[PDB]
Design an enzyme around this catalytic site. Structure first.
Site, mmCIF file in Angstrom:
data_model
loop_
_atom_site.group_PDB
_atom_site.id
_atom_site.type_symbol
_atom_site.label_atom_id
_atom_site.label_comp_id
_atom_site.label_asym_id
_atom_site.label_seq_id
_atom_site.Cartn_x
_atom_site.Cartn_y
_atom_site.Cartn_z
ATOM 1 N N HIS A 1 51.735 96.581 56.195
ATOM 2 C CA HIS A 1 52.709 95.609 55.703
ATOM 3 C C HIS A 1 53.884 96.363 55.111
ATOM 4 O O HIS A 1 53.702 97.319 54.331
ATOM 5 C CB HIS A 1 52.067 94.643 54.639
ATOM 6 C CG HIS A 1 50.953 93.805 55.204
ATOM 7 N ND1 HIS A 1 51.121 92.493 55.562
ATOM 8 C CD2 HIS A 1 49.674 94.125 55.539
ATOM 9 C CE1 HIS A 1 49.982 92.012 56.036
ATOM 10 N NE2 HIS A 1 49.095 92.991 56.070
ATOM 11 N N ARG B 1 48.984 80.262 49.602
ATOM 12 C CA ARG B 1 47.763 81.034 49.421
ATOM 13 C C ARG B 1 47.902 81.841 48.135
ATOM 14 O O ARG B 1 48.719 82.767 48.057
ATOM 15 C CB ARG B 1 47.504 81.944 50.623
ATOM 16 C CG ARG B 1 46.216 82.698 50.492
ATOM 17 C CD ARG B 1 46.033 83.593 51.710
ATOM 18 N NE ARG B 1 45.786 82.780 52.893
ATOM 19 C CZ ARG B 1 46.196 83.085 54.112
ATOM 20 N NH1 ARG B 1 46.863 84.198 54.353
ATOM 21 N NH2 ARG B 1 45.968 82.226 55.109
ATOM 22 N N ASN C 1 52.153 89.279 57.777
ATOM 23 C CA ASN C 1 52.294 89.409 59.234
ATOM 24 C C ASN C 1 50.966 89.093 59.894
ATOM 25 O O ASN C 1 49.949 88.888 59.223
ATOM 26 C CB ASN C 1 52.792 90.804 59.659
ATOM 27 C CG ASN C 1 51.833 91.902 59.307
ATOM 28 O OD1 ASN C 1 50.639 91.876 59.670
ATOM 29 N ND2 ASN C 1 52.344 92.908 58.626
ATOM 30 N N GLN D 1 51.037 84.384 48.150
ATOM 31 C CA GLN D 1 51.709 84.402 49.479
ATOM 32 C C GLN D 1 52.439 83.069 49.742
ATOM 33 O O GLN D 1 51.894 82.020 49.471
ATOM 34 C CB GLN D 1 50.684 84.771 50.567
ATOM 35 C CG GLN D 1 51.186 84.716 52.006
ATOM 36 C CD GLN D 1 50.091 85.005 53.011
ATOM 37 O OE1 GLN D 1 48.994 85.433 52.649
ATOM 38 N NE2 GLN D 1 50.373 84.770 54.283
ATOM 39 N N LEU E 1 46.590 97.752 52.341
ATOM 40 C CA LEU E 1 47.677 97.202 53.141
ATOM 41 C C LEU E 1 48.751 98.242 53.448
ATOM 42 O O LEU E 1 49.656 97.962 54.245
ATOM 43 C CB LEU E 1 48.299 95.984 52.417
ATOM 44 C CG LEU E 1 47.309 94.864 52.103
ATOM 45 C CD1 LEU E 1 48.013 93.726 51.291
ATOM 46 C CD2 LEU E 1 46.708 94.260 53.351
ATOM 47 N N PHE F 1 54.410 88.278 50.429
ATOM 48 C CA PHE F 1 53.487 88.144 49.315
ATOM 49 C C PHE F 1 53.924 89.022 48.150
ATOM 50 O O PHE F 1 54.609 90.049 48.303
ATOM 51 C CB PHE F 1 52.014 88.459 49.742
ATOM 52 C CG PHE F 1 51.790 89.849 50.241
ATOM 53 C CD1 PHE F 1 52.208 90.229 51.510
ATOM 54 C CD2 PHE F 1 51.180 90.767 49.438
ATOM 55 C CE1 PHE F 1 51.933 91.553 51.995
ATOM 56 C CE2 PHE F 1 50.890 92.097 49.925
ATOM 57 C CZ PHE F 1 51.324 92.464 51.183
ATOM 58 N N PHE G 1 44.648 89.373 43.454
ATOM 59 C CA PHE G 1 45.185 90.019 44.632
ATOM 60 C C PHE G 1 46.669 89.720 44.876
ATOM 61 O O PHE G 1 47.482 90.638 44.772
ATOM 62 C CB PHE G 1 44.368 89.630 45.858
ATOM 63 C CG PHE G 1 42.970 90.160 45.842
ATOM 64 C CD1 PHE G 1 42.701 91.430 46.307
ATOM 65 C CD2 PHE G 1 41.920 89.384 45.412
ATOM 66 C CE1 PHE G 1 41.423 91.923 46.331
ATOM 67 C CE2 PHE G 1 40.636 89.885 45.410
ATOM 68 C CZ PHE G 1 40.385 91.143 45.865
HETATM 69 C C1 LIG Z 1 36.916 89.282 53.785
HETATM 70 C C2 LIG Z 1 37.571 88.187 52.950
HETATM 71 N N1 LIG Z 1 39.006 88.458 52.827
HETATM 72 C C3 LIG Z 1 39.639 89.231 51.845
HETATM 73 C C4 LIG Z 1 38.878 89.847 50.731
HETATM 74 C C5 LIG Z 1 38.659 91.234 50.743
HETATM 75 C C6 LIG Z 1 37.921 91.819 49.738
HETATM 76 C C7 LIG Z 1 37.389 91.023 48.776
HETATM 77 N N2 LIG Z 1 37.556 89.702 48.727
HETATM 78 C C8 LIG Z 1 38.266 89.109 49.694
HETATM 79 C C9 LIG Z 1 38.339 87.608 49.525
HETATM 80 C C10 LIG Z 1 38.742 87.336 48.092
HETATM 81 O O1 LIG Z 1 37.008 87.140 49.770
HETATM 82 C C11 LIG Z 1 36.957 85.774 50.219
HETATM 83 C C12 LIG Z 1 40.963 89.385 52.171
HETATM 84 C C13 LIG Z 1 41.183 88.667 53.390
HETATM 85 C C14 LIG Z 1 42.309 88.456 54.200
HETATM 86 C C15 LIG Z 1 42.167 87.729 55.375
HETATM 87 C C16 LIG Z 1 40.948 87.141 55.713
HETATM 88 C C17 LIG Z 1 39.816 87.350 54.951
HETATM 89 C C18 LIG Z 1 39.948 88.109 53.785
HETATM 90 C C19 LIG Z 1 43.360 87.465 56.211
HETATM 91 C C20 LIG Z 1 43.492 86.427 57.086
HETATM 92 S S1 LIG Z 1 45.097 86.509 57.741
HETATM 93 C C21 LIG Z 1 45.492 87.895 56.759
HETATM 94 N N3 LIG Z 1 44.474 88.269 56.027
HETATM 95 C C22 LIG Z 1 46.882 88.524 56.720
HETATM 96 C C23 LIG Z 1 47.960 87.495 56.323
HETATM 97 N N4 LIG Z 1 48.597 87.001 57.527
HETATM 98 C C24 LIG Z 1 48.829 85.694 57.658
HETATM 99 O O2 LIG Z 1 48.637 84.880 56.764
HETATM 100 C C25 LIG Z 1 49.398 85.264 59.033
HETATM 101 C C26 LIG Z 1 50.724 84.504 58.854
HETATM 102 C C27 LIG Z 1 51.756 85.401 58.175
HETATM 103 C C28 LIG Z 1 51.248 83.949 60.187
HETATM 104 N N5 LIG Z 1 48.317 84.507 59.686
HETATM 105 C C29 LIG Z 1 48.094 83.099 59.375
HETATM 106 C C30 LIG Z 1 47.503 85.173 60.477
HETATM 107 C C31 LIG Z 1 46.384 84.406 61.130
HETATM 108 O O3 LIG Z 1 47.622 86.377 60.668
HETATM 109 C C32 LIG Z 1 48.946 88.299 55.502
HETATM 110 O O4 LIG Z 1 49.943 88.805 55.987
HETATM 111 N N6 LIG Z 1 48.649 88.429 54.197
HETATM 112 C C33 LIG Z 1 49.483 89.193 53.249
HETATM 113 C C34 LIG Z 1 48.669 90.245 52.567
HETATM 114 C C35 LIG Z 1 47.441 89.597 51.940
HETATM 115 C C36 LIG Z 1 46.667 88.794 52.984
HETATM 116 N N7 LIG Z 1 47.507 87.836 53.686
HETATM 117 C C37 LIG Z 1 45.549 88.032 52.302
HETATM 118 O O5 LIG Z 1 45.563 86.847 52.170
HETATM 119 O O6 LIG Z 1 44.636 88.856 51.817
HETATM 120 C C38 LIG Z 1 43.579 88.261 51.003
HETATM 121 C C39 LIG Z 1 42.823 89.402 50.344
HETATM 122 C C40 LIG Z 1 43.818 90.375 49.695
HETATM 123 C C41 LIG Z 1 41.881 88.905 49.243
HETATM 124 C C42 LIG Z 1 42.011 90.152 51.411
#
Ligand SMILES: CCn1c(-c2cccnc2[C@H](C)OC)c2c3cc(ccc31)-c1csc(n1)C[C@H](NC(=O)[C@H](C(C)C)N(C)C(C)=O)C(=O)N1CCC[C@H](N1)C(=O)OCC(C)(C)C2
Ligand SMILES: Nc1nc2c(ncn2[C@@H]2O[C@H](COP(=O)(O)OP(=O)(O)NP(=O)(O)O)[C@@H](O)[C@H]2O)c(=O)[nH]1
Ligand SMILES: [Mg+2]
Lengths: 169, 163
Positions: free
Chosen positions: B124, B53, B100, B61, B120, B111, B58
């Protein structure tokens, strides 16, 4: 002529929002989990003899991005509120979605369908009657679905179109 | 504090090396998991795994070496371990933090921030930062997208402990 509908798919993590959408859009199912950040799709279908262009916003179950999630709800015209029939917490989460949608859209009458997914599985924890009673209290349709078998998939999305159409008239 | 490295590849071609300082002095348990997964010394770890990802502006990951599809990973302590502390915050580019699925679900996924991600904080566990190779992380963003899917396979072709 055509009519276009802005559908938004919400619900708790892993309830099957994307599996439902992919069955509608692509006509298949896989057991592999592909966690959602955000995805959008377009599909032309016939509903009630009328041609309909469906815009589907598949949201993540993650709830911590209120600014973005509020705009999903402002823009969206109808909401598919999904829980899983073997996840009681996901059913308890449903009223939060209805409350947030009513709040953001400033209305107690928003087009909404309650969807109880994974009905193929043998591990049910949420009775059909419980979900039927909750949808009645909201005045909205309840449909049980399985993204795996395709049971109720077309019905759930097309019912949502009908609720939008009724509301707009 | 230990330093570890990742040699990043793009469809198998070397992109460059990223090195990290791990904050063992402040987050020992979380730093030691990442250190050991980087050396492979427990018989499993990051070598070969991908950044699944990449969202430009941002973070990058990765770390799922058990299911290879962004759903998996595990720690040296078991499938999950608890949030160790929230002493450090996501203050800007280069921060290394645990991914997480809610409280106390740390495994191996991690990440690297490419911007400040203060929302976060407290959720985190921050435990390191990029030392050298921030230009490599910046170059990784060419291959990401708004929903994080990558247009090429971005892998940790090699990794280990330095110094
Ligand atoms: C509202 C849209 N939207 C945005 C966002 C917000 C404002 C503006 N624009 C956006 C995007 C560009 O508009 C499409 C976000 C975002 C994040 C999520 C879902 C939707 C999101 C999301 C889904 S799951 C998660 N976040 C935490 C994820 N956990 C897992 O992957 C676990 C794993 C470890 C087992 N998993 C799979 C399950 C299910 O938990 C995790 O730890 N990280 C590590 C930290 C960054 C983070 N991912 C991530 O990707 O942030 C994306 C980010 C920063 C853009 C935030
Ligand atoms: N048996 C069965 N499994 C289902 C059904 N719907 C989804 N699944 C499975 O449940 C898991 C989660 O499905 P998914 O559609 O990704 O759920 P999601 O609500 O989109 N999750 P997210 O909130 O991360 O975006 C996947 O392994 C998928 O195969 C269903 O009707 N029956
Ligand atoms: Mg999904």
């Amino acid at each position: 002529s055509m009519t276009e509908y802005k559908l938004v798919v919400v619900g708790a993590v892993g309830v099957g929002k994307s599996a439902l959408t992919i069955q509608l859009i692509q006509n298949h199912f896989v057991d592999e989990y592909d966690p959602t950040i955000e995805d959008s799709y377009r599909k032309q279908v016939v509903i009630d003899g009328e041609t309909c262009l469906l815009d589907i916003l598949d949201t993540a179950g993650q709830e911590e991005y209120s600014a973005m999630r509020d705009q999903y709800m402002r823009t969206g015209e109808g909401f598919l509120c999904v829980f899983a029939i073997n996840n009681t917490k996901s059913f308890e989460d449903i009223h939060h979605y209805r409350e947030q949608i009513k709040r953001v859209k400033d209305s107690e009458d928003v087009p909404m369908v309650l969807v109880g997914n994974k009905c193929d599985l043998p591990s049910r924890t949420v009775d059909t009657k419980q979900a039927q009673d909750l949808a009645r209290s909201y005045g909205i349709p309840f449909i049980e679905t399985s993204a795996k078998t395709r049971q109720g998939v077309d019905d759930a999305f097309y019912t949502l179109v009908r609720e939008i159409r009724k509301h707009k008239e | 504090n230990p330093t570890v490295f990742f040699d990043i590849a793009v469809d198998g071609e070397p992109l460059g090396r990223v090195s990290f300082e791990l904050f063992a002095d402040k987050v020992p348990k979380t730093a030691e998991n990442f250190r050991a997964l980087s050396t492979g010394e427990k018989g499993f770890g990051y070598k070969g795994s991908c950044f699944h990802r990449i969202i430009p502006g941002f973070m990058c990951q990765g770390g799922d070496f058990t299911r290879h599809n962004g759903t998996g990973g595990k720690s040296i302590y078991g499938e999950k371990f608890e949030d160790e502390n929230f002493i450090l915050k996501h203050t800007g580019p280069g921060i290394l933090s645990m991914a997480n699925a809610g409280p106390n679900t740390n495994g191996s996924q991690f990440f690297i921030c490419t911007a400040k991600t203060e929302w976060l904080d407290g959720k985190h566990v921050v435990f390191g930062k990029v030392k050298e190779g921030m230009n490599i992380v910046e170059a990784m963003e060419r291959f990401g997208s708004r929903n994080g899917k990558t247009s090429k396979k971005i892998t940790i072709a090699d990794c280990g402990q330095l110094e």
